[PDB]
């Protein structure tokens, strides 16, 4: 899983704890 900070995009859900804010994770 990714951690925070660990960019993304809008609706991913790979953070390992949380979902995509300002586009990372």
Known sequence: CK???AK???LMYDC???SC???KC
Do not use: A
Request: hydrophobic fraction near 0%; glycine fraction near 34%.
């Open 3 to 5: 951690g925070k900070g």
């Open 8 to 10: 993304c995009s809008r």
């Open 21 to 23: 804010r300002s586009g």
């Open 16 to 18: 390992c704890t949380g």
